Symmetry: C3
Subunit: 45 residues, 3 copies
Amino acid sequence: RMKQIEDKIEEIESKQKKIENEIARIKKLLQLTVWGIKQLQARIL
Amino acid sequence: RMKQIEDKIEEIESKQKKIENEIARIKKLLQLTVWGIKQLQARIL
Amino acid sequence: RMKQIEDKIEEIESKQKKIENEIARIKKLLQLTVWGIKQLQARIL
Ligand SMILES: [Cl-]
Ligand SMILES: [Cl-]
Ligand SMILES: [Cl-]
Ligand SMILES: [Cl-]
């Protein structure tokens, strides 16, 4: 039962690192959409 | 104690599932705003 | 062994809280980026 607990934890940690990666990539794309909007803003103004 | 550990792990998994679901919604919204901005770019440039 | 399990759970929940905080921030920034887009649209059209 402790083995089963340990294996579930290791799976949880692994899925959590993939969420951290996904969030990191999201923030990079978001920073680029923000830069794109400010570019357009500069132009129409 | 193992009961308390098992309960904690099932809340963490539950919460991690809802994080994954919010991350998918964020990616779709992000995809929509990248497209909206591309629509502006083609019309403004 | 059970202490190491508990410790790891506490590490995982702490990271989860920080992830949730990142998701909420990213959602706000996204809402603002969408607003900025809809403003440019209304101005252009
Ligand atoms: Cl065991
Ligand atoms: Cl998580
Ligand atoms: Cl027990
Ligand atoms: Cl112990």
